[PDB]
């Protein structure tokens, strides 16, 4: 999986 | 099996794009559960899990 976080939900 | 809730965008990196009302499956998450892989018509990668639901 990628080491950044994900974006939030809108 | 899951449906998507809002389009995301590849960020590549073996994510993966997806778009609202797709269907995926869903193979895991990563250590801290904000990251799914995810299987949809389009391929396999990681989606985020906040963006998918469970459909059914």
Not at chain 1, 1 to 10: F, G, R, S
């Amino acid at each position: 999986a990628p080491t950044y976080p994900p974006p939030l939900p809108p | 099996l899951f449906v998507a809730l809002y389009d995301f965008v590849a960020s590549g990196d073996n994510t993966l794009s997806i778009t609202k009302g797709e269907k995926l499956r869903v193979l895991g998450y990563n250590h801290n559960g904000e990251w799914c892989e995810a299987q949809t018509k389009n391929g396999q990668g990681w989606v985020p899990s906040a963006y998918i639901t469970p459909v059914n």
